Amino acid sequence: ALNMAIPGGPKFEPLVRWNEFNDINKIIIRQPIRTEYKIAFPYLYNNLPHHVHLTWYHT
Amino acid sequence: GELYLDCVMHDLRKMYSEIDIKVADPVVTFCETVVETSSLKCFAETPNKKNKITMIAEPLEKGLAEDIENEVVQITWNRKKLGEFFQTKYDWDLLAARSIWAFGPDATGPNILVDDTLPSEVDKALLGSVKDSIVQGFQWGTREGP
Amino acid sequence: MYNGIGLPTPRGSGTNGYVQRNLSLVRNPDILDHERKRRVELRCLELEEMMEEQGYEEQQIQEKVATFRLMLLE
Amino acid sequence: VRKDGFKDHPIILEGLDLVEEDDQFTHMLPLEDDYNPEDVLNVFKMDPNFMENEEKYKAIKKEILINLVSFRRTIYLAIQSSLDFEECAHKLLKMEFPESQTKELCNMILDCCAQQRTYEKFFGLLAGRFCMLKKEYMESFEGIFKEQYDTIHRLETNKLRNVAKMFAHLLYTDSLPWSVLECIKLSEETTTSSSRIFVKIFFQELCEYMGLPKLNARLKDETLQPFFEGLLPRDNPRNTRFAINFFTSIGLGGLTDELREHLKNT
Amino acid sequence: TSYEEFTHKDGVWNLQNEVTKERTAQCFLRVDDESMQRFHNRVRQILMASGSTTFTKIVNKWNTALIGLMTYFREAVVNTQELLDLLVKCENKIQTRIKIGLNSKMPSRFPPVVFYTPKELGGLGMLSMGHVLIPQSDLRWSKQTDVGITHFRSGMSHEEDQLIPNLYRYIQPWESEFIDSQRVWAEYALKRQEAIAQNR
């Protein structure tokens, strides 16, 4: 539903098919925000989260 | 935490607003501390150029910040009780312990306003008269931070 | 497809896919003048004279000790 | 000790297993049992069968007593297949050559630019990326740079032009240090005409792609004057005259104004 | 320019001053979008006329248009990565048009041996664009900045290593061509002057 995939995970079609948040003078980069982070916290990391299924947490 | 804020943003995006809302990067907030004292005895003065105030900023000790933040010592204590607290375990001078005026940016914040002035003890009644306004200026300065 | 890197599907293109890592990427004098008076006031407080249990007599003894300390420092 | 299983101090230790377990015997002698200390055989005795005992002890003692061509082909095919030097270095790190042939790798870098009619910055950027990934390619480039200065005269004019552009693109990009550049000596007696033309083309590319006050700043710092004293001797002053007129007749001037006033006051 | 000069992959002309003979500026070179539009329309004309055209003539049309565009542009090609995507897609589409002209789309039945063999050896000899690796970087910061190369994608799935040679490693760059042209023509002018002067 958000069209990014694990290298071990399968790939699919895109389901759907300027911002000052993308300013380089307001973004500090220390660690990369990778696929796992955006999957685990979709409302935190993925703008426009649509039809997103939230995972189970740690049993 | 990130799970807490993702839950908050999920509640905002689903129940409390129907609007798709862009989210920036998560960062943290910092504070301001110092390493060495103020090398200049620096002053300012009132817009009517009569009252001239000179003060220096220096680092605090180890346990004092967490003690004020946990309210181990209080300004609600007696001044002698606060002096005994600063003199038994922090080994302060009694004059420097009685020189303490206010604590930090808020109620019991980790900054210590020491007013030890022998040139200005000749007008210490006027100094105590302007003590409260010095306390709100100190609280506002430590609240904002330059 | 992985992260924001790579084409989302190889069906549209003629590629197979297989995004892979670039291995070739590299990797104070007024403070001292006040501190002299602070040491003078510290000597004034350490004079104390709270052993004879006097009032103005202990204040006069502490003033005598303070003027003795000022004469010794000067 | 029970959790680690006595890993640091095992029961089986080296330096004490000099006896076979088949020849040894396992007997359980307890402390609470009547364990004889066997002090009878420890001391010497005057046995009447001493000759037979000595014979038995002596009997017991006697009983116990090519690829380089395929390397060139693979290197050249990967170079001509690769569009970018980034893709070329990534392909070479994919195929993972051993470090025993990094000088041969530098050799087929310099030869693949030597085959070019016109200099392309592809090979210079590849050389700089090889310098800036691992240090061993940089040391191989330094050693082959000294060897190329030893063998300037073997190459033709466009070949020496391309090799001069290699060493320029190593040095204005700071991919090689300036410390190995003391192999060049500005001496008209020993250096070849090809060496002088090589140094002239290399310094012309330096003066083109980076500024001449910046070049004088790079050339007049005191730390690299132990490596510039081959270039700038200020001794046997006909060689100083040769250096002055050489850096003037290139088209620069300027760089030898210190040598000019040295010639004036000496 | 901040930092220093940019050691660039021949698609930036370092601009030499006439007086000081020094690079004082940099000229980033890219390809116009209408040029890729016209090239894609030329490939569309090739596939348009491919219904009654033999395979060798199709390879000739492809190679002619490809070397015309490639020798016209050369240096600015490497800065335009969507041109490389169009090249890979059009190479795959003409190979797919060959797989439509035959009644098989089997990739084992269609190796690159049948395409990259020259017709002097009885093959086709169609040229080599898409046996390279597309550079990949951040799509967030690609629109704003220039962030270098972080990853690589294959052009098309070929048989393992291949190392099929790219044509840009046989065409000389424009800046080197102009510099060598000026040097060679000045040297020829001095040679002609010497021939006139000695009357030799």
Side-chain angles (χ1 to χ4, degrees), chain A residues 1-16 18-59, chain B residues 1 3-40 42-47 49-97 99-143 145-146, chain C residues 1-27 29 32 34 40 44 55 65-68, chain D residues 5 10 15 30 37 48 59 66-137 139 141-191 193-200 202-263 265-266, chain E residues 1-158 161-200:
Chain A
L2 298 176
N3 209 30
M4 72 291 291
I6 306 298
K11 326 180 157 75
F12 288 95
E13 290 289 329
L15 192 148
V16 71
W18 176 81
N19 314 320
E20 62 264 26
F21 276 177
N22 291 7
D23 171 44
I24 57 174
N25 317 323
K26 283 175 189 183
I27 289 309
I28 312 180
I29 297 187
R30 297 281 326 129
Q31 323 296 320
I33 307 299
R34 321 147 49 95
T35 298
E36 304 93 5
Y37 299 100
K38 302 209 144 204
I39 280 182
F41 309 99
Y43 293 92
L44 208 73
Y45 289 117
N46 300 289
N47 301 312
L48 271 295
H50 269 308
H51 310 86
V52 189
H53 295 68
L54 293 167
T55 62
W56 209 253
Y57 192 69
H58 186 239
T59 78
Chain B
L3 181 60
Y4 171 79
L5 288 150
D6 184 87
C7 284
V8 171
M9 187 66 204
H10 155 71
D11 292 356
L12 174 62
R13 267 168 159 162
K14 285 293 298 302
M15 283 73 74
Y16 303 118
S17 171
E18 60 266 17
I19 313 297
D20 314 328
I21 300 149
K22 301 157 302 193
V23 180
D25 295 12
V27 291
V28 309
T29 53
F30 305 103
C31 276
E32 299 154 6
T33 186
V34 287
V35 169
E36 197 262 327
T37 77
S38 298
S39 66
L40 165 65
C42 185
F43 71 102
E45 69 172 342
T46 54
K49 320 285 174 208
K50 272 92 166 182
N51 318 318
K52 183 178 179 180
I53 304 166
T54 311
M55 183 278 288
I56 59 170
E58 86 190 26
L60 265 169
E61 274 82 6
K62 318 179 63 174
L64 282 177
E66 48 259 36
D67 268 358
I68 296 161
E69 275 162 327
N70 298 330
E71 287 83 32
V72 189
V73 64
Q74 288 89 346
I75 55 166
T76 79
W77 286 354
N78 190 21
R79 192 62 145 273
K80 180 64 177 176
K81 176 62 190 298
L82 185 137
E84 285 146 357
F85 187 81
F86 273 66
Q87 184 177 2
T88 49
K89 58 206 71 54
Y90 294 109
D91 292 331
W92 274 43
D93 304 331
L94 73 164
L95 176 60
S99 299
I100 297 161
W101 268 8
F103 280 161
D106 44 348
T108 74
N111 302 293
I112 295 194
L113 186 57
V114 164
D115 175 78
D116 197 0
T117 47
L118 276 76
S120 300
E121 83 202 357
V122 296
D123 47 342
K124 65 178 73 175
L126 177 70
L127 184 55
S129 300
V130 304
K131 170 182 78 173
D132 44 357
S133 44
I134 278 168
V135 160
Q136 293 95 24
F138 151 76
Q139 281 263 312
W140 207 342
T142 51
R143 217 154 48 235
Chain C
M1 187 66 203
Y2 180 45
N3 291 319
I5 318 291
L7 190 65
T9 180
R11 190 196 65 156
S13 160
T15 187
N16 57 339
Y18 187 40
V19 62
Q20 66 162 342
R21 196 163 77 254
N22 180 24
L23 280 72
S24 74
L25 208 47
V26 293
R27 76 191 216 171
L32 287 159
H34 187 273
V40 160
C44 284
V65 162
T67 46
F68 157 71
Chain D
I66 49 170
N67 62 293
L68 179 57
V69 175
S70 66
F71 193 41
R72 288 159 53 223
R73 159 170 308 270
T74 129
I75 276 171
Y76 182 67
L77 277 186
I79 280 171
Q80 299 305 99
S81 173
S82 52
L83 165 71
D84 201 23
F85 75 103
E86 295 290 330
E87 317 164 9
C88 204
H90 156 76
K91 273 155 184 162
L92 286 165
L93 286 184
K94 189 69 64 159
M95 64 184 73
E96 276 290 329
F97 288 132
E99 272 301 308
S100 48
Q101 50 269 60
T102 181
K103 191 77 64 167
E104 296 176 352
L105 172 65
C106 297
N107 275 277
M108 282 74 75
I109 284 170
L110 273 294
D111 293 347
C112 277
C113 197
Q115 297 332 287
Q116 286 310 299
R117 321 186 69 232
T118 61
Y119 158 68
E120 322 194 353
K121 297 190 288 184
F122 171 76
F123 299 101
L125 283 153
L126 187 71
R129 183 49 69 109
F130 266 124
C131 283
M132 295 298 103
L133 293 174
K134 300 211 66 167
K135 217 174 303 299
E136 296 93 345
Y137 310 106
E139 302 138 17
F141 271 129
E142 287 142 30
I144 209 173
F145 150 76
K146 196 172 174 72
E147 195 38 68
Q148 273 318 296
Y149 191 70
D150 297 325
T151 61
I152 284 297
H153 63 279
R154 310 303 292 113
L155 261 59
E156 54 94 15
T157 178
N158 192 64
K159 267 183 193 319
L160 281 177
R161 198 175 307 127
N162 287 343
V163 172
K165 297 308 172 63
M166 293 297 102
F167 298 150
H169 206 86
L170 286 158
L171 276 296
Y172 63 86
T173 332
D174 292 357
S175 302
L176 282 199
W178 307 83
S179 310
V180 286
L181 271 76
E182 75 181 353
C183 75
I184 304 105
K185 261 74 65 182
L186 262 186
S187 86
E188 70 272 27
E189 312 97 309
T190 69
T191 350
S193 70
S194 54
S195 166
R196 261 75 58 87
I197 286 155
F198 187 83
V199 159
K200 152 194 85 185
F202 155 74
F203 270 105
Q204 271 150 353
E205 181 77 11
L206 284 193
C207 174
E208 283 200 355
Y209 272 26
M210 61 66 58
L212 194 142
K214 209 178 290 187
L215 193 45
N216 268 312
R218 208 74 43 84
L219 268 167
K220 265 74 172 182
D221 65 324
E222 211 271 333
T223 76
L224 309 168
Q225 300 314 315
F227 317 111
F228 292 151
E229 58 205 14
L231 277 297
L232 273 62
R234 302 174 192 87
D235 186 271
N236 184 248
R238 49 173 292 276
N239 303 345
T240 315
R241 260 158 280 174
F242 156 73
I244 282 155
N245 299 25
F246 177 60
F247 279 179
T248 313
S249 65
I250 281 166
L252 315 178
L255 281 71
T256 57
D257 298 354
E258 199 268 347
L259 282 82
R260 269 153 193 259
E261 54 92 20
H262 157 263
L263 183 64
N265 62 7
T266 55
Chain E
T1 308
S2 58
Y3 309 101
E4 58 264 357
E5 82 266 11
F6 201 52
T7 54
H8 188 89
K9 59 182 182 293
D10 295 327
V12 168
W13 278 348
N14 287 269
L15 302 176
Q16 178 156 3
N17 188 31
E18 209 81 14
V19 183
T20 64
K21 314 300 192 182
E22 295 180 354
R23 311 294 172 165
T24 55
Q26 280 197 152
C27 191
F28 309 89
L29 302 172
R30 279 187 54 86
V31 193
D32 181 35
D33 307 338
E34 209 266 351
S35 306
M36 283 74 75
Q37 278 306 111
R38 209 205 330 270
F39 161 70
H40 176 41
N41 289 346
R42 274 193 71 122
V43 180
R44 275 161 69 173
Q45 288 177 357
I46 284 174
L47 302 180
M48 181 36 49
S50 172
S52 52
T53 305
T54 68
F55 300 145
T56 302
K57 289 184 182 293
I58 282 163
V59 167
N60 290 348
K61 287 184 178 181
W62 176 256
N63 286 338
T64 306
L66 173 64
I67 70 177
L69 191 75
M70 187 66 204
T71 50
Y72 183 68
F73 277 110
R74 307 182 196 207
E75 294 184 349
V77 174
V78 74
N79 302 327
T80 301
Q81 326 297 319
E82 52 268 65
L83 195 152
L84 272 300
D85 297 331
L86 186 54
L87 277 178
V88 163
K89 191 190 292 307
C90 285
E91 178 180 345
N92 188 81
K93 277 185 75 65
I94 60 154
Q95 282 146 356
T96 314
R97 190 48 60 170
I98 289 154
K99 290 149 205 159
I100 284 302
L102 292 183
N103 292 114
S104 170
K105 285 165 81 170
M106 186 66 204
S108 82
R109 284 190 145 113
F110 285 82
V113 192
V114 310
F115 300 117
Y116 290 89
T117 305
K119 62 192 71 168
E120 290 91 354
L121 297 175
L124 288 176
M126 61 80 71
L127 259 65
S128 169
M129 295 298 103
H131 296 280
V132 293
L133 302 168
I134 318 164
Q136 302 292 279
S137 285
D138 291 335
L139 268 295
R140 179 170 181 205
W141 314 108
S142 57
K143 303 203 301 177
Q144 309 301 308
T145 47
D146 292 296
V147 294
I149 300 164
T150 78
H151 272 74
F152 278 125
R153 200 173 192 84
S154 80
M156 61 224 67
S157 59
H158 44 268
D161 44 356
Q162 277 325 288
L163 293 184
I164 301 299
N166 198 8
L167 160 72
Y168 192 44
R169 304 270 75 77
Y170 294 92
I171 314 180
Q172 295 174 1
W174 278 121
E175 204 174 14
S176 59
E177 268 156 346
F178 296 153
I179 284 157
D180 193 37
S181 178
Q182 188 147 12
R183 170 193 79 87
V184 158
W185 273 89
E187 178 195 3
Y188 156 73
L190 272 296
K191 276 165 191 166
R192 197 158 163 275
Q193 170 258 330
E194 280 302 309
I196 289 161
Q198 308 318 293
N199 266 328
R200 61 178 180 85

